[PDB]
Predict the structure.
Amino acid sequence: HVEVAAEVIFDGIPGFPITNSFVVAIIIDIFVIALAVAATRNLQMVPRGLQNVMEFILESLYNLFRNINAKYVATAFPLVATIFLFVLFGNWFGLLPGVGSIGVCAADLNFTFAIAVISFVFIEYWGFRALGPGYLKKFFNTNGIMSFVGIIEFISELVKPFALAFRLFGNIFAGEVLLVVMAFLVPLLLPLPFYGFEVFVGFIQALIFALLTYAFLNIAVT
Amino acid sequence: FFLYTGPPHVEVAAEVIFDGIPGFPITNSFVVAIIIDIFVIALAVAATRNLQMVPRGLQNVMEFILESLYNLFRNINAKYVATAFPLVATIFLFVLFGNWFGLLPGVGSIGVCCAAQGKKLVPLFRAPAADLNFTFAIAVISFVFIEYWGFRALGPGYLKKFFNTNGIMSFVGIIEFISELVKPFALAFRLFGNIFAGEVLLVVMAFLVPLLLPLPFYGFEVFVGFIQALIFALLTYAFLNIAVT
Amino acid sequence: EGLNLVATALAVGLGAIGPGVGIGIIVSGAVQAIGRNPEIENRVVTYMFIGIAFTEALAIFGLVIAFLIGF
Amino acid sequence: EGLNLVATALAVGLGAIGPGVGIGIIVSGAVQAIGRNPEIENRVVTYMFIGIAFTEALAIFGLVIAFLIGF
Amino acid sequence: EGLNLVATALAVGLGAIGPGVGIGIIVSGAVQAIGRNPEIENRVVTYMFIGIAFTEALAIFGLVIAFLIGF
Amino acid sequence: EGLNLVATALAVGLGAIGPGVGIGIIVSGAVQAIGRNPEIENRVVTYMFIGIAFTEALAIFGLVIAFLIGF
Amino acid sequence: EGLNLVATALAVGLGAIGPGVGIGIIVSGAVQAIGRNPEIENRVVTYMFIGIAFTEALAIFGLVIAFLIGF
Amino acid sequence: EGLNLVATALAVGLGAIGPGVGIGIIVSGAVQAIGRNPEIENRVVTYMFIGIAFTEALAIFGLVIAFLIGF
Amino acid sequence: EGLNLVATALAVGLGAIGPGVGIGIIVSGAVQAIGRNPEIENRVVTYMFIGIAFTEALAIFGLVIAFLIGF
Amino acid sequence: EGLNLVATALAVGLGAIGPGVGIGIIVSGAVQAIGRNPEIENRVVTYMFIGIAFTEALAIFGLVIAFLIGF
Amino acid sequence: EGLNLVATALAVGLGAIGPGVGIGIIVSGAVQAIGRNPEIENRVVTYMFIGIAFTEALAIFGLVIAFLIGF
Amino acid sequence: EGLNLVATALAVGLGAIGPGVGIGIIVSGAVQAIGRNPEIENRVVTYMFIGIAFTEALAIFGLVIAFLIGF
Amino acid sequence: PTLFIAQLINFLLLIFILRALLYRPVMNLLNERTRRIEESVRDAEKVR
Amino acid sequence: NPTLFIAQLINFLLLIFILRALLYRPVMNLLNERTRRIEESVRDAEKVR
């Protein structure tokens, strides 16, 4: 029997007594802090596993951003790092991690919208900071005949973060719906590794969100 | 140019029946088929003629057509190029004959008793190509010939082509056998739709402005009929070769 | 009502689309083969002619049945 | 309730869809060929124009059938 | 009621869109390969006809379903 | 009633679907060919104008059909 | 009611459109491969058959569902 | 009733996908054209915006008509 | 209200549409690859069968919906 | 009523065509790349699996609704 | 009356597709040109982003019209 | 009634074919480029994931409206 | 009826068009075939 | 119907068999004989040399 439901809440309004999304975020933060504590205090010159996560995640992402945009990856390194080590972790915690929204007496639209608002604030702050009037460039200028849609391009960029928030909420919520459907009929995931596919899809979605943030920053650069 | 009149009406049907039903049930398609066979026999007799290696004389045309068909069959394959050549040549110039005679004067109006009454004015033309029975029989015969050739050449091969194609896991069989079975029905339906569609066009389109509208339509229909006859003749050999291969 | 008229419209349009797009690829391949080895000019003429002849064979099937619905 | 209106609209639209996507590929191939070599020239122009007229015929059908319903 | 006419129109339109681009790219690839080499042109010309025939068979199925609906 | 409104919508949409990909392929082929070599720029531009004229012909046919249905 | 007839039309048409272009692509790629190098026709043709059969499987699934709805 | 909303939905939806992908074809063609030869980039610049303008002229026909439906 | 029949018809046809041309394009790529690299069958035909398995698996899920109509 | 089953059929049909042709294009590009050079096959297969996973995500998006409507 | 809901679904149903195929094709040309000529950069990228914006403008229009009719 | 349900089916199902083919074409071009030039493996991957970010965004434009219209 | 007259007129026009369209090429092909056969006969005579 | 189809099949089979025996056999034989005569004539020219 399907029993899925929407966890839409208001970020502006006070947190609800249940606060499923807030509880999931707290659990993900606790797990991340536990991993950081395990990798920080017990850190050696050549740690295996503890420093492997750092080398293969943080350093790899920094190298990728530098390759995509060197000297701007440094400036917005905090934004991409914040996009990373999160959302994916929240989905992993929400991927039926022993609860599965059962035994109760990223998917949140508000959280995704706030993340996209942070992305757009990153634009308004850093992007075109080197130019100031860069946002006005190629937008109803003297060459506006060939750049009439340039303001439309800016609107799409304004709609690009909203679509990024939608993609954060979407797919992640889908995975939950698919797991609920499998529980209702044909439980234990499915004949195929449903759970593994959902986990990989969430990881790919988080990586794509980080890369989309970096690419939007680069586009704002030029 | 103007077509002031002549557009009386339009009327079509699936098929047309003929007389002679008392002694033996005869449809107008049987009459058309008999006429086509008689014309083919007459052409062969004239083509044979003295047969003393006479060049041209209207027999060289038939000889060249037969040689071209033989070359096409040989290029398709050589295991049964000789034995099955008469089988393909049977369709050749017979499906072509059926496609022909559709543009004859009053081909669709032949044997009508008469628009006044039309009580028992069944059009006794019923082009043999434009009949489901003839196409179904031809396709069944072709499928039987292909199956027999496959069984004779590689009896184990015909069965192993499907049952033993891939014994482990899944196999090309069943799907392959189903496709081959649909192939006979597909060939039958192809002849059914063709020729019949041309006749329906020659009726309906010419019903309005029958002046230079039916002309390109009939040219395209004749080209399509010849192409369809050649396609069926080549497809029989192709299915036989695929069975052998 | 005009549902039969809608049927005629659907038949003619959705039977014109197929041949209409197809012949484009036909003659595009033809002119490409003209630009590369035009020695086959006779062959490409014959083969593009029969290919189109199939295309408006399908088209005229659509048109004649559309007239039948309109009949 | 105005079924002939939607019938005419559908006929025109689904008749006019084809020739654009045809002619695109059509002249793209010929222009690529002539860019490769300008020798064929008019010969390719002639190969192109008749091919385009073939889809123009289907466009004519699409317009005319709607015209019959329209009047 | 007239919905049978709509069924026939839809069936033939589908059976016409289906193999249109099919046979188009068929003969396009055929003339292409012929231009690459006119030596093995006969073998490829033989091989492309069964491909034409399968698409034509699908079109004929679409058309005869409409005729069956008619009668 | 509203049938004319959706009729106009369908007409404009299905008259814009075709010429869109049409002109897209037109320009892609033209820019590719002129990128192959200059000195045929005038000829490719003339063929480009022919292509845009032929696509916009069907475009305006759909547009004027919708416009006339508007009254 | 006529829902059965439109059901059969939809079944056969929507199940035949796919395999039509499918066969198109199959034998197209096959003919470019064979013209490019027909020394491996033995296998290329075998691959075409296995692939032709795979697409015809869907074609006959559509056809048999249409037949079942028809009876 | 909401048939006006259906008309707006058809107007915005249909007629947009055509130009939407036509734009992509245009820019991709220009991109490989300049990649193969960057010295013709100025001519590519001239051709790009005009092609984009024409496909967008089809798209804006699709859009402003929907605004007219909205009134 | 016999909407189940049209439902299963649309399901089977419009689920089989995609995998048809999917099989077509995968085997076009594979026949090209074999016309380039024949002995690589052991790996390339394995990738072929994997991609095949996904496609008809999706079509078979559509068929399971068709049988759910039977349920 | 049966409209819920029609909804499921339409949802699965439109959700199966997309990934159905998607995965076909995925594996097509992968196999042309392999036939070009079977030395980067590891990276090619990894990116092919990534594309397959994205197409499967689209399929699941279009498929879960089929059971949701049943709920 | 849910007909407005159907209209919105259909509107966004085709609204978020134009770029779908567009970004599919545009990126292909971009990466192919980069592989052909890795020296040229940032000009292909500026054209890339311009094309992306022009393609996705239609999707944004579809979505915003859907919102306007839905609220 | 169930018209809201079939509207949800329209919303989720539509907007899938285009993004599916886009997901196909993006990695097809990417793997063609990377096999043609492995030294650009990083940049081709980035230009692949940007296209991912756009096409999946279109797919989620479909999905989010499917859930909004669903509730 | 008048349909027979229309069909006869169309058939007459088609025959008139075809007799001038490619009848000469058909005659040329037939003459070429006969010439090839005669050349084979002449070659046989010469060789013998 | 089915009887008419069977009769048409029998008539076509008889006509095809008659044609294969008379025309197809003899026409093919004549063409093969002409070709073989030309080839053996080339051989006779070789023998002449």
